[PDB]
Amino acid sequence: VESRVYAERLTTYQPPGAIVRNDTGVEEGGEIAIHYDPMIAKLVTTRLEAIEAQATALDAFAIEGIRHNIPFLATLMAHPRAPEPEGPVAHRLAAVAAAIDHKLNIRKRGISGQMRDPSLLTFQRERVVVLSGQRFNVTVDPDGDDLLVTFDDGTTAPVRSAWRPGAPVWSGTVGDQSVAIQVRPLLNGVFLQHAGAAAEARVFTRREAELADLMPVKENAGSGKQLLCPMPGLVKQIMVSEGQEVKNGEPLAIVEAMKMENVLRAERDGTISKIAAKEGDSLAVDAVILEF
Amino acid sequence: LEKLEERRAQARLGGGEKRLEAQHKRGKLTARERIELLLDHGSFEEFDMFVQHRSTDFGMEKQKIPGDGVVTGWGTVNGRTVFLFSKDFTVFGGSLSEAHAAKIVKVQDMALKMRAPIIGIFDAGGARIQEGVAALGGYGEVFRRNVAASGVIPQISVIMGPCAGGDVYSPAMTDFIFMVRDTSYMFVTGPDVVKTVTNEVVTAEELGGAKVHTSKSSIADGSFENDVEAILQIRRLLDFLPANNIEGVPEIESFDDVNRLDKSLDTLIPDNPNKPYDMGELIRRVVDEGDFFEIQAAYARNIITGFGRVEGRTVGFVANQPLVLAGVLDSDASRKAARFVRFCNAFSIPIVTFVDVPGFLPGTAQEYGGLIKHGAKLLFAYSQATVPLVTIITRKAFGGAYDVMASKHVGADLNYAWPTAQIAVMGAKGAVEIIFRAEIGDADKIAERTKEYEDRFLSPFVAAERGYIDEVIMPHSTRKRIARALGMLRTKEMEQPWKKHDNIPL
Amino acid sequence: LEKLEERRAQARLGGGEKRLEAQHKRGKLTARERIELLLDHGSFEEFDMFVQHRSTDFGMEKQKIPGDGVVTGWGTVNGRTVFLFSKDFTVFGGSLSEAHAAKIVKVQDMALKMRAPIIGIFDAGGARIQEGVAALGGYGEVFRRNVAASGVIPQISVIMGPCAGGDVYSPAMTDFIFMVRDTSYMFVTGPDVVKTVTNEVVTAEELGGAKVHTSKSSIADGSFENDVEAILQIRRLLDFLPANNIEGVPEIESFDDVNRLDKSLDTLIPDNPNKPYDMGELIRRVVDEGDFFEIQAAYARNIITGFGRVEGRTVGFVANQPLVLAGVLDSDASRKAARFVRFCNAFSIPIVTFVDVPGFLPGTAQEYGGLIKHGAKLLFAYSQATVPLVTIITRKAFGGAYDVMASKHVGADLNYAWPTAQIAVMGAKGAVEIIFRAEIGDADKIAERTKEYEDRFLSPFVAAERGYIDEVIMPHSTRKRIARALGMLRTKEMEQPWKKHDNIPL
Amino acid sequence: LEKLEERRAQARLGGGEKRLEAQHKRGKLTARERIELLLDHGSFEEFDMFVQHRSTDFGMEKQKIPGDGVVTGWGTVNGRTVFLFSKDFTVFGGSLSEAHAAKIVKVQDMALKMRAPIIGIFDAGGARIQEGVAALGGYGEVFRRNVAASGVIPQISVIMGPCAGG
Ligand SMILES: CC(C)(COP(=O)(O)OP(=O)(O)OC[C@H]1O[C@@H](n2cnc3c(N)ncnc32)[C@H](O)[C@@H]1OP(=O)(O)O)[C@@H](O)C(=O)NCCC(=O)NCCS
Ligand SMILES: *C(=O)CCCC[C@@H]1SC[C@@H]2NC(=O)N[C@@H]21
Numbered sequence A: 001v002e003s004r005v006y007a008e009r010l011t012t013y014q015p016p017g018a019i020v021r022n023d024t025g026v027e028e029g030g031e032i033a034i035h036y037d038p039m040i041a042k043l044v045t046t047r048l049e050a051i052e053a054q055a056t057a058l059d060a061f062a063i064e065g066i067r068h069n070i071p072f073l074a075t076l077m078a079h080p081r082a083p084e085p086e087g088p089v090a091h092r093l094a095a096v097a098a099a100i101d102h103k104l105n106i107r108k109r110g111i112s113g114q115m116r117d118p119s120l121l122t123f124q125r126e127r128v129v130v131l132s133g134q135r136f137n138v139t140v141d142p143d144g145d146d147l148l149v150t151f152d153d154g155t156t157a158p159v160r161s162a163w164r165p166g167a168p169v170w171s172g173t174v175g176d177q178s179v180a181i182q183v184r185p186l187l188n189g190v191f192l193q194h195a196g197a198a199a200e201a202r203v204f205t206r207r208e209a210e211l212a213d214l215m216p217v218k219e220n221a222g223s224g225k226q227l228l229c230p231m232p233g234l235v236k237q238i239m240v241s242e243g244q245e246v247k248n249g250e251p252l253a254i255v256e257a258m259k260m261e262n263v264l265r266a267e268r269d270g271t272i273s274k275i276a277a278k279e280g281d282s283l284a285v286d287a288v289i290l291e292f
Numbered sequence B, C: 001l002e003k004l005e006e007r008r009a010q011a012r013l014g015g016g017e018k019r020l021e022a023q024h025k026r027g028k029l030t031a032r033e034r035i036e037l038l039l040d041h042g043s044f045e046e047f048d049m050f051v052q053h054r055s056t057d058f059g060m061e062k063q064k065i066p067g068d069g070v071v072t073g074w075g076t077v078n079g080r081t082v083f084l085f086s087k088d089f090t091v092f093g094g095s096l097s098e099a100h101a102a103k104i105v106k107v108q109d110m111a112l113k114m115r116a117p118i119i120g121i122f123d124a125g126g127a128r129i130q131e132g133v134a135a136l137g138g139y140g141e142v143f144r145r146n147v148a149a150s151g152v153i154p155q156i157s158v159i160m161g162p163c164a165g166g167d168v169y170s171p172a173m174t175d176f177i178f179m180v181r182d183t184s185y186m187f188v189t190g191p192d193v194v195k196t197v198t199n200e201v202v203t204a205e206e207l208g209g210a211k212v213h214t215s216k217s218s219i220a221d222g223s224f225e226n227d228v229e230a231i232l233q234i235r236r237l238l239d240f241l242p243a244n245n246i247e248g249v250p251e252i253e254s255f256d257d258v259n260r261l262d263k264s265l266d267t268l269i270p271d272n273p274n275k276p277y278d279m280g281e282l283i284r285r286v287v288d289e290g291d292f293f294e295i296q297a298a299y300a301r302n303i304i305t306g307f308g309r310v311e312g313r314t315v316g317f318v319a320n321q322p323l324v325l326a327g328v329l330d331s332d333a334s335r336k337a338a339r340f341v342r343f344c345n346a347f348s349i350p351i352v353t354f355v356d357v358p359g360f361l362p363g364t365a366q367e368y369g370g371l372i373k374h375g376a377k378l379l380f381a382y383s384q385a386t387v388p389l390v391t392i393i394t395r396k397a398f399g400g401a402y403d404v405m406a407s408k409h410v411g412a413d414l415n416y417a418w419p420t421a422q423i424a425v426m427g428a429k430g431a432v433e434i435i436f437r438a439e440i441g442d443a444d445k446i447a448e449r450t451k452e453y454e455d456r457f458l459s460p461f462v463a464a465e466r467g468y469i470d471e472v473i474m475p476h477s478t479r480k481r482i483a484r485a486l487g488m489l490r491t492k493e494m495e496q497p498w499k500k501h502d503n504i505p506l
Numbered sequence D: 001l002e003k004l005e006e007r008r009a010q011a012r013l014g015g016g017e018k019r020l021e022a023q024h025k026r027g028k029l030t031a032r033e034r035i036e037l038l039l040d041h042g043s044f045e046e047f048d049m050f051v052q053h054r055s056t057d058f059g060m061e062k063q064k065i066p067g068d069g070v071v072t073g074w075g076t077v078n079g080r081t082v083f084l085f086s087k088d089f090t091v092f093g094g095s096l097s098e099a100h101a102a103k104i105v106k107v108q109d110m111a112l113k114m115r116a117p118i119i120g121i122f123d124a125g126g127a128r129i130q131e132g133v134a135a136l137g138g139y140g141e142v143f144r145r146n147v148a149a150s151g152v153i154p155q156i157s158v159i160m161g162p163c164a165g166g
């Protein structure tokens, strides 16, 4: 079986009984060239082990700077033929989400200039790892390189890998089940993708988790219904029609102000009624270009 | 004696159960919860739990609540000592009586004596009217101490609720102000006086809310979604900062390799001279693990400033940002960079600068706003500093701007340049128009002269031939060079004359 | 030899007799005439008369004019040594090339080493394009030296003609900028570029003329009718200033008497609390002989700042001005007073303050304009100062403002008060409306409460009872007391900890 | 970019293949070989590779060779930082001009600021006559820095060829 990764600028592109081989279309530092077709790469390797190795290699595959389509492939391969982690995968994710924290903490307890040797302080073996809506009461314990992450009811899973923060692909073994997960940094916690699923995991101690609940669930409003022009410039190109729809963050128009290109971006999942501008017209601050 | 335990349990209750419930309902934590969450487990030592106010006018003598509305003490964060005080909204609205100020001054004085940081958490309700002129005295003392410590120990402030009246002047004199997004605001005068004087009707949030102060006024250095986020991020930040102006920056063992190359950088700069790129990507590609703590992220985005780590040491980064307003220097960006550089120099943190600047912002509005002095501020900041300075000229440096931004002549130690650099007195078209003015009639000839000037003079090599550039480097090696350079630069020691203080253009 | 005399006379002609007559026709003097007029008769010693330029590109090698566009040297003013340079508009438009720059840097270095003032007269026309990148190098070195000397020697700048381009930064970092009323202007970018980029069409005078920079932007410290008046006033001012930061202020023999009484002051403050009074009369009545050198006279007129003499010694004066905006504090006045106090303190000049302030100016415009930090600047400058401070509270101080204006709490040495002083947290009406809020319906009872509060608390005697006021004096004795107090305070000696430099808000 | 690598290769060649072979025929090493042999492997960082002289007299404007006859930079010896400069006999006989002097003064100043040793390797031929009084100026500045550094950082000199004149 062979995976045909498709694109549907590249900041990072770090491709990976199984023997695989990749055929690379574009290398790192390339662009999305409107001339040719959309295509990125090909990756090739019994039916069962084959599909499993394809899954794990897919997960290993790292792409950043654009909106690639690998999640779709991973999901539609997951089916027997975005969700939230569940029974088999949620625990496997929580384990890693705790081990990463433990590693960062062991390295962060070596800061210089302390007042009394930190060895006398004793770690806390209880922790509450919180996924995007779930909750798990983990008890971590250092016994060798591998850790022993005991759950509540009694299920244990010794995490064991050699991932150093910065490397955008965690890869190791949890409960003798080889695993490749993609991590991204966040504000307080990490961003994980293992199967088709994705999650934003945070990890707290008991009291802090007892505290966080008090905080209210902040809400997100909307913008207006016009694409206001925030730069006193000279319009260069409107690259959309009147009757199309646009998803959040997509380029709509492009102007020139200080002889440097500036691109506009929509903000709501709504179709576009009537342009309030035109090619080459001059705009000062607060000038309507679109009417959502 | 159990009586002391009883008294303690009654003091830890602030101003009543019901006011605490009202506090939790607005989404805010209480003073003691904040203290408990910031510090390491079990390290908090409290001072002056039982102080009381001493006024007897206007019926105040009938309600004496212990603690006078502020909680103060000291503890440890990551093993290093810190002092902190937190104002208590549930006790007379957190106002400032005489005894209140006595506690604050005691804690500030002691912190300056032991040379340790100070964290202030504000949730107050202004001046206590009943104490008349007495209250004012309190204010005064606090101010003095702040100024005495400025530049000796780092001071961090966190605004977590209303802060109105004269009180607002205390945080203003600290090194960093952080704010909570939807439940804080700062102003000198409140809406009612604004109405009575100017007939303008404005709500508190629109007058002084977090957005206004993080995007327009320059006061605040950042916002956060809620209290927990703010406190955890303050704890994270504290690990970057030195403890005082004597000891160096703290150092931790790094997980990264100091000799790695990154081929991708060879394509970052676009070939078309009018297409922009994001400097932030480069900055996050040069720090240890892609971690970068941004300062004043939402204000004056034509310049980027922040703290990162190289080889386990904190380093400050300043960079021009092409994505917004073509990266020109204006008044706001100049002020932001000047104050940040002054902080970095005061505590002996090395500085890295990435330069891509075509000039200053033209127009009548900038001149009527006093752009001259604002742009002079940054030059002053760079030129007086005595710490290592390393600069990288990625694509452009035209005119006088090329001097303010840490040029060899104003005291930078090492100046590298990528091959795409263009160092010149002004753009090709303007220069040729000025030099060959007597023929501004012709068209083909002017184009010919422009081509000749552009190929001869708009490159890094004339600058190198004059010795203003130490080395022209291939892009993909940039990180390595920095990591090596800073090493040799650790010993920079130089002497200057004796002055009371500089006379920076305010 | 006479051939040497001929070569010298040729160097004395600059760019030619025709260009000199054209310079005169505009109503301006030549560089050498200005130098001759400023310095004491027969004292001018010139450096580097024959320096020439070294460029060989764009056909510039065929015109070598000696002097290269600047006259530099040293002399004496009233017997005291001074160094100075003056740009010559007739030679390549006073442009700044490498060889030109070297003279300037030489004289700056020598002035710093011998610790004497520097006077710079600007008449330039910007960067000489033909020199390419080298030009920038020149600029850079000059900037550096300015910053090195700030706070060691007083530096004065006088703009007597066009001053476009990057060179404008060279005067901005000096202590004082004086401008001529109808022939000078300053801007970073000229009208042509403004028009091309923004489509606005403005003349040079409307963009950077003297009026704009003395009334809106805060750059200029004064304006004058013509060159002669400007130079004579600069000479006059120079006698006030200390030579360097080590010696003391100059002394002359005074014709005034320290024991004179002035009965008039008994009626200065009107009985009617709304009608205003002129503070400038009081200031001019307290100085030695009614001689007062005003700084920034035309900008932010709600505050008054200047130099006078008491008992033959220079003294700085800061005072609130009721005649404009009721004497309130705002951002502009705050910056003005803060920079001035910083200078005075840097060179060990004592300060006298006259206080009449009702609060801060309300309105959204100030909040969006950053009033918090601008106001903190002045408090900072006062509280850090280590020279004698004497304060007089003529009419009223209210709220937080009472603390920024040299309060006893922020380190003032002596605080006097006239009998009419009203020191309180705020006005009577607002205070009573806040305290007795549960009965605000009535109008008669509120008037009763207002009358009782007003009579009890709005006086200087409650503040005195707490010991915040050293003495309540009679107005007609004020001068004598000041003259005595300053006399004792000459010996002030205090010591702060060790810092590299403060972190004043910007 | 390839043009930069090529210009580097042209600056490393100094005064030409023939002069280098003649240098080896005398039994002497060239400047870059000495620098490479003294310092730890891979540690040499060079300053100011492309500097050129700025004289126009006596036709000198027709022979412009990058580097102006001196190699300067810094490196490590047993892990400790050291600064060094080495005169190059092939380029204009290793003589001393203004632009030449600027490199020496830069490296001396930096070495004094950082408080590290200085090694100087000499293979020169004296003052370049065509430069006139300017050349003297060069001499002067170098002397000054020497005197400031004495008794602050140790300074070592190695004479590996003719070193006549001033
Ligand atoms: C914003 C502000 C009003 C906080 O009050 P709030 O959000 O509206 O909520 P509340 O009205 O319930 O006030 C909280 C309580 O503390 C008291 N309080 C608040 N600020 C006070 C102060 N400066 N001095 C004395 N008491 C104060 C209030 O009387 C109130 O009484 P309560 O405990 O019985 O409830 C306050 O910070 C402020 O800015 N005040 C300035 C406005 C003014 O001119 N007077 C108000 C003081 S009464
Ligand atoms: C081409 O159209 C150039 C116009 C403006 C030049 C650029 S943008 C404005 C900046 N200011 C300046 O001096 N030049 C820069």
Ligand SMILES: *C(=O)CCCC[C@@H]1SC[C@@H]2NC(=O)N[C@@H]21
Binding pocket: B189, B193, B196, B197, C328, C358, C359, C360, C361, C362
């Ligand atoms: C009476 O009309 C009261 C108006 C407000 C008094 C003035 S406004 C400016 C000062 N700020 C303040 O708080 N009070 C003063």
